[PDB]
Amino acid sequence: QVLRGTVTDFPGFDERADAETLRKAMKGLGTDEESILTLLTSRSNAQRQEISAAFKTLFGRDLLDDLKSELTGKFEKLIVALMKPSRLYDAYELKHALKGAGTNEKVLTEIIASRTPEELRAIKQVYEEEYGSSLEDDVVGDTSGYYQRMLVVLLQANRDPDAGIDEAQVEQDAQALFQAGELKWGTDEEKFITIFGTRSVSHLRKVFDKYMTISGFQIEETIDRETSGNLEQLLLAVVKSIRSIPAYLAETLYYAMKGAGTDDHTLIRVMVSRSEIDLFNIRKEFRKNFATSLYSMIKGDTSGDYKKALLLLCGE
């Protein structure tokens, strides 16, 4: 489709005027969170970077250090996320899922499955730049088995082009997946990793259809979500992303709020990282799949300034 974000460049932007408002909001005893909230969610990421620059040229101060000293809580985490340069943000969040004891597999899967090969090539490059090390080495460092192998394949950013549907291979592949799926995805993993990882998106959507007509089922049905198995989670994310990235991300949001409490980390990461890409399309998938709006779901799951900020990111 045509991807539509919910945040665009503010017309009539003046980074100096904005820098002064933020300075005033912060200056002295207490904070005007409401003024910060509304300013920042109504400027695009590139404008926020122009505000930081102007804040340091006027005041000799660092805006992000200031925000971090003035704010707290989930509101702080949301604001700091917004302030990240768009080009770094996916990298940063991968770096945080990997760095330390254990791994945050959830974030690894989500970003690596739902970002396009072009996004991935850029994240790899920025990760190396920023963090000194290769994303691929750090992933191999943290993960094992076919989960690791399948991430590394996706990390090569080399899917076949969408050109010729070789309906002979479509039938072969669909049969291969039929077999493997009946076998609970636990045999011949090497076969399917190559099919999921390297075939073109238009091929694979053909495979999924063909599959269903062979089995009667949708290939997702042969996996169950809430329970375990990193490779299965990864398989499910890839199949959903091949179908529709905004649908898969809408579902990740739904489940970030569904149940006791919220996965605020996920809610923040998706709302921010997609705000200027496809968040509008995500809003429409959510509504049609989950028969409620994202807005009301956020409004019911969150509170305070953190909630106001998110509802202004979201829209309607």
Smallest distance from Ca ion to CB 272, Å: 18
The token duo for 163 is 């050109």
How many other CB atoms are there within 10 angstroms of residue 292's CB atom? 12
Indicate which single residue of 18, 110, 142, 264 sits in contact with Ca ion (rule: CB under 5 A).
142
Smallest distance from Ca ion to CB 66, Å: 9
Binding segment for Ca ion among 105-113, 132-140, 181-189, 299-307 (CB under 5 A)?
299-307
How many other CB atoms are there within 10 angstroms of residue 216's CB atom? 8
Smallest distance from Ca ion to CB 205, Å: 33
Does 292 contact Ca ion by CB under 5 A?
A: no
Nearer to Ca ion, 68 or 243 (CB): 68
Smallest distance from Ca ion to CB 237, Å: 20
Q: Where are the alpha helices (DSSP H) in 143-220?
A: 145-155, 167-182, 189-198, 201-215
Torsion of CA 2, 126, 240, 238, to 10 degrees: 140
**Torsions phi, psi for 309 (to 5 deg):** -65, -45
Cα angle for residues 173, 146, 270 (degrees, 5° grid):
90
Nearer to Ca ion, 72 or 144 (CB): 72
Could you say which residues in the range 223-282 bind Ca ion, by CB under 5 A? 257
Nearer to Ca ion, 22 or 195 (CB): 22
Q: By rule CB under 5 A, what count of residues binds Ca ion?
A: 8
Smallest distance from Ca ion to CB 88, Å: 20
Residue 160 contacts residue 203 (beta carbons within 8 Å): yes
Indicate which single residue of 72, 144, 218, 303 sits in contact with Ca ion (rule: CB under 5 A).
72
Torsion of CA 6, 7, 11, 16, to 10 degrees: 160
Which residues have a Cβ under 8 Å from the Cβ of 316 and sit 6 or more positions away? 283, 293, 295
The token duo for 142 is 């943290």
The token duo for 42 is 């109504």
Nearer to Ca ion, 241 or 302 (CB): 302
| DSSP letters for 106-171 | HHHHHHHHHS-HHHHHHHHHHHHHHHSS-HHHHHHHH--HHHHHHHHHHHTT-PPPS----HHHHH
Smallest distance from Ca ion to CB 301, Å: 5
Site mask for Ca ion (CB under 5 A), range 73-92, x = bound: ---x----------------
Nearer to Ca ion, 123 or 176 (CB): 123
Could you say which residues in the range 171-190 bind Ca ion, by CB under 5 A? none
Indicate which single residue of 90, 93, 301, 305 sits in contact with Ca ion (rule: CB under 5 A).
301
Residue with tokens 């404008």: 47
Site mask for Ca ion (CB under 5 A), range 28-67, x = bound: ---x------------------------------------
Question: Distance between CA 248 and CA 240 in Å, rounded?
Answer: 5
Binding segment for Ca ion among 2-10, 23-31, 120-128, 264-272 (CB under 5 A)?
23-31
Question: Distance between CA 176 and CA 73 in Å, rounded?
Answer: 49
Q: Which residues bind Ca ion (CB under 5 A)?
A: 31, 68, 72, 76, 103, 142, 257, 301
